[PDB]
């Protein structure tokens, strides 16, 4: 292979590995904030579904 092909092939390799590296660090930071604050799709632990509540008038009036 010529030096240019190897040279520019290396730039292509470096670009991909640097884009993967930046995303790996961002993912760790995003996971740090999602887990600590609970305001994202991840670490979304379930709470009771309010569709289970019955709102029909009850036998007594205070409820």
């Amino acid at each position: 292979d010529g030096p240019e092909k190897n040279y520019e092939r290396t730039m292509a390799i470096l670009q991909i590995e640097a884009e993967k590296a930046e995303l790996r660090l961002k993912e760790l930071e995003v996971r740090r904030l999602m887990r600590a604050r609970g305001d994202g799709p991840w670490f979304h632990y379930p709470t009771i579904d309010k569709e289970l509540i019955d709102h029909s008038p009850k036998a007594t009036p205070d409820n």
Binding site: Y7, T10, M11, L14, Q15, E17, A18
Partner: protein, 170 residues
Amino acid sequence: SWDKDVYPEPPRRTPAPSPQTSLPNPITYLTKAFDLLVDRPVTLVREFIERQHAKNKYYYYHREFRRVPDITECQEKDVLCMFEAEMQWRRDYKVDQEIVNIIQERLKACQQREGESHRQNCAKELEQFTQVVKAYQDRYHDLGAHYSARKCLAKQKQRMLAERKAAKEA
């Protein structure tokens, strides 16, 4: 065959023969024997070979490298620029090594050429060797096996700071 400016050579001053003896000089006769027996047949063979080379003539070239931004212009962790700057620094590092080799070859040729007078007649060769080696030492010494343009730059900045302070002592 080579550049006479890169590898300078003082003019050759040879005495003329001035014999003071009746006896024949063997070197004179042996020189003629060598020229007849060795030089001429060796010269005929080379002339034949060069004739073949004048029929198949083709060329090769010295690769020319465009200059690219140095490591000083690269943003931290910007590999794409760091890569091209780093490769350039490595190329110049290897060229600087051979420059020091050239200067060392000049010094060693002078020492042989001047003989017993070499201490006085090789001063300009010795001074230039000192200057280039000093420059080479400043650029590249103590970088370690894992050298790089980044490490080379850090070494310079440390020297530029030390020189700046010593200047500020005035």
